[PDB]
Paper text:
In this study, the effect of physical and chemical factors on the orientations of macromolecules was investigated through an analysis of selected well studied macromolecules, and important parameters that determine the behaviour of proteins on cryo-EM grids were revealed. The test proteins used in the analysis include human C-reactive protein (CRP) pentamer, CRP decamer, human erythrocyte [name], SARS-CoV-2 spike protein, E. coli PaaZ and E. coli β-galactosidase. We performed a comprehensive examination of how macromolecule orientations respond to alterations in physical factors, such as freezing temperature, and chemical factors, such as the addition of surfactants or the presence of affinity tags, during grid freezing for a standard set of proteins. Hence, electrostatic interactions at the AWI are an important factor in determining protein orientations in the absence of any additive.
[name] exists as a dimer of tetramers and possesses D2 symmetry. To visualize the surface-charge distributions of the proteins, electrostatic potential maps were calculated by assigning charges using the PDB2PQR server at a given pH and were visualized using ChimeraX. It was observed that the charge on the preferred view was positive in the case of [name], neutral in CRP pentamer, CRP decamer and PaaZ, and negative and neutral in β-galactosidase. Upon the addition of [name], an even orientation distribution was observed for CRP pentamer, CRP decamer and [name]. In the order of homogeneity of the orientation distributions, the surfactants can be ranked as [name] > Tween 20 = Tween 80 > A8-35 = CTAB. Further, the use of different surfactants or sample preparation at different temperatures does not affect the structure of [name], as shown by the density of heme in [name].
Author numbering:
A (entry chain D), B (entry chain B), C (entry chain A), D (entry chain C): 5 to 501
């Protein structure tokens, strides 16, 4: 049988020739029995003085923690990232120090929509989270499997998710809400084209690219800075499932992703991604036609060639799923000195948003869990006593700054980068930004005829459930994209209507 | 379209001719805009003084609460229970006071295994929770769709669930663990026969019976007591899905149950259950062949006729799903004066187990949520300040008992019932109890030939994934049940092997 | 006896001629007894089936919620705020709409240092929190009893509190940490003069002024804006305790504040504060000598006359202490359209800081507690399901924005005010700002000789416990203030040394 | 200066000749500065992209955990317990295995009434918690400084505490509630005599005895059992403060206990307690005049001589207060094989009560904190994933019992002890038990005349604040004790009245 099917047997194979341990309570008390409760005779009530039953049950009651607000489903792995090119001219970060550096990494694949226990094979953006344990602490690159996103305003992310998830009264999936929100916000027409294309349903998790999709800013040792995007493309080649094959797999194995990834890791065919960077200088950022920090826009390849940096390989399965996938925390705020944030609105939103949900779900001291703890660095600061602190709490060191008792002092070299902006502070409306150029280029340059047919078929198949006027608004936006696009969509609609 | 598909439209239909309200923050502050964040110019970073974005995001982060440890999936409804017979000779409870009493009820259907978001149509015991708002507070009847259960010892319930759920390392469903636990505990051979029979997959939720399955004890006004079981059978007739139809529906609509129940409630075809009681006197309990409080045994119909009491009808959908299904709490401990607990070990376990998980998941003051609050009675006790108390905290009344300031005093009439037991207090082993008689009667009396064929087919189809020696132990237990049973199972096994 | 001593008797006096209620469980089940547990005979163990004991104990275990990080001790009251002057030329807020408006208010007095249960009469800044239930939601004015504060940088507030509180290893109060932090940050020399003056220990809570101390910004109906400060001064006259009287009261009645305030409210002598505003125009803000938004600076009275607005009166005691003082939440972010935040760094910090601790301590839905709920307005937004939501969750309304189902839409009139700033975005150092002018004016103009003697005595009495070199640095800062000041401090020091 | 005054200096003395560390964020990111926030120019608002401020503030907000429901104030120490006599004839426990065994121990002193931050020197029972890290897991002996307690029924403990704590409406201490509850429950007259005697206020914490006060049961290797009580008496001699000295110290140093204990531990005068056992055989338990398991009764010394076992010495201060005193959990349920619970009602209540509050306050996985973790044993069981699990979660081992993959199996030798009880299961009333004999013996045998005078003075001084009829009921109970007692109390009363 497959490794995922012969897991516990392998455990018995590894733990041969050693005697089985003694079943004890949480507090090391060895127990008499765990196959019967204390009673008053054979047909009598229970006694409170049966402590083992009470302890076991009271710990069993609290086995669940709040699922993530988004990307609930998940499959994780561990590996090491390796450098192959010099980019020290761009960054000071110890992750790009020299050639031949092994940095431990954790990775997690997720589905933005599906809750804990849904069928994985569904038309939804896949999430690709990477965490590097750099010598200067952690770095979290939280990417999507698409180079863009539905919206460009952070204040709309809650509503968006509310539309993508179940109904408030019926508690069902409703295409009505999804298509209403999509038609009202035209800035999404691009991402929709990506979502309903052939690359919408990837082959498990080893056959899909991953994109940073955020305009980061690198600073060199000299203090100069350039804007950049991170990419990483698969070495196993892009592979995607037909709608019928995904439909069959959603019934056969609802968790095909986790099974495939685990079988591949236990088999020895180590999956690998190649790491690329797009670089842009400040003058180019000033002379770019669109807004160079808009999340819905991409950078054309011709004007911005890719630059190889390194590769990712995953060579370890999680010893336990819960402690290494359910309890892992990715903060886009964890950026080492050498990688800064930009004026990109969505990145600014995420910097504040992520740690709050991490404190709610895991616990106020989530940074002390061994999967999150930065063991390749040293933690020393003026954070103190919180709920469930598993460390020594840094002993009796002074806990106020500044002081005069030789306490930890700031590093003057890790200062941030400064750049001047001009204009009033107010609310700017961005609903008037371009939405039709890049999607048109994607339509008439990237796709062939058969893939256009499949795309229109998928969109019509998912859109046939909406109301009449939402359908009219959607097809109006699509004919705004291109006449052929809208005409095909509308034709298949009246075929379904 | 169907009501579940035309929900929000109906809302717009109900709220016609009234102007749309003003979008405000949590604290009633009317907002300027919710379509853009404060920036420093058009391409500048965000400001902290954008309070609305911070508030919205920080509330969006905490939208998830820990899912139930079991029975995560759910569909709820509201109705009223109505009496049609006099059982005042048996109970003092105000729910059975007289003929013509309308008691408000909440009901919830669930699946013991499937987490939040799985396909509903699966071979697993369905849970049937009812809550009566009796004039003397709440009463929670937490039943199964089968008259029995897998085990008879409460200390084994955690392990059982751990076997029924995902693997700890691979995080997949493993038939290995399930069948190992089932073969090691022969007391389950009965329930398995129920689970893998034709009634294992019911038709939505309106086509399945519900059973209390616990030996309760009723006490009259005179103080005399009799043991009893509660039943309630559907008026729409038993209906079940073929394995192929359930397989297709698990892909088409993963939430067929909620959809069907909601469409039926909104259509007007009010589903109804008939309420029956089995009664037994103390002498009968002393002269019963098996243990009359064993959870794996049933009471033969001939010796114990059914007694009609009333009917349940569901005539209201939840106004909001989360506040009326996600936040409802059923405690088998909430039993009004007139319905007592018995020496049944599993009922004793549940009495302590349920409130603990309810305090963990919802909150220490979960009894103040309008869906749980006993509005048909008066709450007055010496419970005080806790986290998030939404009530007046009963004002400045004395908070200690006893006192001399005319505070709430105990009701001397609601005393419990007392009965003497003989024998030492110790651990009794119950693994030597009968496991083969009732299952044999179920096999050779209840079933026809075709249903036997289907049962053996289903068991073999689910068991073909286990190891060799677990298969040998399972077929050994089955041949212990009956030779034909085991022979058919083994034949289909070597066909699959 | 005094009302605070004859509280519960009065309850018995109010509830005369009505029969005592029935003691019930949380779920309305009337109980048999609450003076003995179920046992197996007279000298036997307990039974689990004693549900009432389990429920009572399990609710008693969770009676504590995390105390506030600061201002733990507290005494609260309720009243109404009344207007007496027209300031509509300055603000649009419905709280200053016209003359003769009654706005319900809640107020709370606290001590920044002392934990829950310490002696109130101590040398520490007193906190004065007011909450108006304006027709456009809540407004929280969270003031101090001094017009200034120790620091001017928000990032230093944690360290500051850590110094003011107990030692990490010994868990005692240490003057060493306090005086080290004070000497290292000279910007505090002003507030210290206020803290160790005669007005440091007020007479209970009805004999102290209260100051907004934050530079707010008002906007009129025309859209023009002016900077302002809020003041409110007592009508009972400033009264302060001698160090010996406060020392005696700290032993006699550790809670003198709560007792005095409650006795005064129950006696009928309704305490009252007069509400004043300081106003400044943008040109004045540009031509001000110091930084007009510095928290350590005041505005000289001569150049900025006070403007009366209204008065506060407290005419109601809390019906229950816990539900009306322990569970009240003041957010400086709750500012109605008409009162904006300024570039004041500390106000910006507080806007983000307060709601986070409020979500941690109370609960994610703390805005649903009747003491915090804005009942004088209407809540309608796209916030949804959270832990322990006591409301109807706004029923089955659409939960995404924008939509096309006549949902709540933004109010275009409540837009914020915009003003341009020039200069790079970076870290500015403020440790070089003036610290000696206003403190010198306070010393040689405000105080007489005897009060100077008392101030120097108090500072020396509290400073005699520090190390030698911390003493040298403190007296160096004081001689930087003025030679006589430092010389007196040093003289009394060598007297104590 | 004293060690408690020269703590942090000593740290600087220990960390001489090493360079100060680098101040980093929780996630190892070294920081630029912590003395100023990011602004838009010198007088501009803050930016969200200042991550360090957000992280620091959000962690500072959650620095508080719910204080214990009782015994909030505390002072802790660490040491080792050493055996000096053979009691293997009585117990099998590895703590009493042989002579010369060093078992690590943690100890904590507390005050049952005073909240976190009150003056320690007050008339209230002191709590003495000891935790042994035995080779077979932890053992928690949670004793009082008196051999008795106020009540004998667990269901009354909440009400009792509610009376001892602050008023619900006024939030003050009220002698009315305390004396009403004491007069209504005469079973307390004994403990009151102990509480208001000279030994009510001990000299710090090194000058008071400690008593198990619970009737435990020991079982030998042979399986025979005997009832027992644990005692431990100080080697520094009983020392107590006069009411005037305690009054002065409550103003001078509110935390005299922690200061004294820490100074003594850092000075080298290692405090020591001598460990004694009272033993009783089953026949003696059957022929005892009173109820031998009543919490309000003691065992006369003459009939039951003390048996020395070992001594406790404290030779280590807590490295950090919070992680070693605020986060320590004592469960009277943690009893190694060899020390059992008895039919004592209060011990049965505590066995269930303690772990629930421990799960609420600390966290569902509180047994993983290094101060609570049983490092002298091995934990291996079927408890799994919970909130904030800091361990490896025992890797991919099977998580269900029983199984067939060589998993941890129960220890058949650690079985519990069984004994038969006779009589019905019901509610027995114990308010008719003797309350006057032992208190009379304590009065006329243990005390001299001067101590009687002091006792009556203290009781009158605390009782002068109650109502008239509560005073009459109290003096009636006291004259029930003895005529002279009541007459003295009443005389001093009319002197105060
Ligand atoms: N309360 C009880 O005692 C129950 C007993 N049984 C079975 O009846 C056996 C003999 O007791 P007896 O008094 O003769 O019961 P009866 O034969 O008198 O009554 C038959 C019962 O079996 C139910 N039943 C029939 N087919 C199925 C099925 N495929 N899945 C689930 N339930 C089914 C019937 O439901 P329906 O009412 O729709 O006919 C009915 O309740 C027992 O061994 C037990 O297995 C089953 C359920 C309840």
């Amino acid at each position: 049988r497959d490794p995922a099917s012969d897991q516990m047997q392998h455990w018995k194979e590894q733990r041969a020739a050693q005697k089985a341990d003694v079943l004890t309570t949480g507090a090391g008390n060895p127990v008499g029995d765990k196959l019967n409760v204390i009673t008053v005779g054979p047909r009598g009530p229970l006694l409170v003085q049966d402590v083992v039953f009470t302890d076991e049950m009271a710990h069993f009651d609290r086995e669940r923690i709040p699922e993530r607000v988004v990307h609930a489903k998940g499959a994780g792995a561990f590996g090491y990232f390796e450098v192959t090119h010099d980019i020290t001219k761009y960054s000071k970060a110890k992750v790009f120090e020299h050639i031949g550096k092994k940095t431990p990494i954790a990775v997690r694949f997720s589905t933005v929509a599906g809750e804990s226990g849904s069928a994985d094979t569904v038309r939804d953006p896949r999430g690709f989270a990477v965490k590097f344990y750099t010598e200067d602490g952690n770095w979290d690159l939280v990417g999507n499997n698409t180079p863009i996103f539905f919206i460009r305003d952070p204040i709309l992310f809650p509503s968006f998710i509310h539309s993508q998830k179940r109904n408030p009264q019926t508690h069902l999936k409703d295409p009505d809400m999804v298509w209403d929100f999509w038609s009202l916000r035209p800035e999404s027409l691009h991402q929709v084209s990506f979502l309903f294309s052939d690359r919408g349903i990837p082959d498990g998790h080893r056959h899909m690219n991953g994109y940073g999709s955020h305009t980061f800013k690198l600073v060199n040792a000299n203090g100069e800075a350039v804007y950049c995007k991170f990419h990483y493309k698969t070495d196993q080649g892009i592979k995607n499932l037909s709608v019928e094959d995904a439909a069959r797999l959603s019934q056969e194995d609802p968790d095909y992703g986790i099974r495939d990834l685990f079988n591949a890791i236990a088999t020895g065919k180590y999956p690998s991604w190649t790491f690329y960077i797009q670089v842009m200088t400040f003058n180019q950022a000033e002379t770019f036609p669109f807004n160079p920090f808009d999340l819905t826009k991409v950078w054309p390849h011709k004007d911005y060639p890719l630059i190889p940096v390194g590769k990712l390989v995953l060579n370890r399965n999680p010893v336990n799923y819960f402690a290494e996938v359910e309890q892992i925390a990715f903060d886009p705020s964890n950026m080492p000195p050498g990688i800064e944030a930009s004026p990109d609105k969505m990145l600014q939103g995420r910097l504040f948003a992520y740690p709050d949900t991490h404190r709610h779900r895991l616990g106020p001291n989530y940074l002390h869990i061994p999967v999150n703890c930065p063991y390749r660095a040293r933690v020393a600061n003026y954070q103190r006593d919180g709920p469930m602190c598993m460390q020594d709490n840094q002993g009796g060191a002074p806990n106020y700054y500044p002081n005069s008792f030789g306490a930890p002092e700031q590093q003057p070299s890790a200062l941030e980068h400064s750049i001047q902006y001009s204009g009033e502070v107010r609310r700017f409306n961005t609903a008037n930004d371009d939405n039709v150029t890049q999607v048109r280029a994607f339509y008439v340059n990237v796709l062939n005829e058969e893939q256009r047919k499949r795309l229109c078929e998928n969109i019509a198949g998912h859109l046939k459930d909406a109301q009449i006027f939402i359908q009219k608004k959607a097809v109006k936006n699509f004919t705004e994209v291109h006449p052929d696009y809208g005409s095909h969509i509308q034709a298949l609609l009246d075929k379904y209507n």
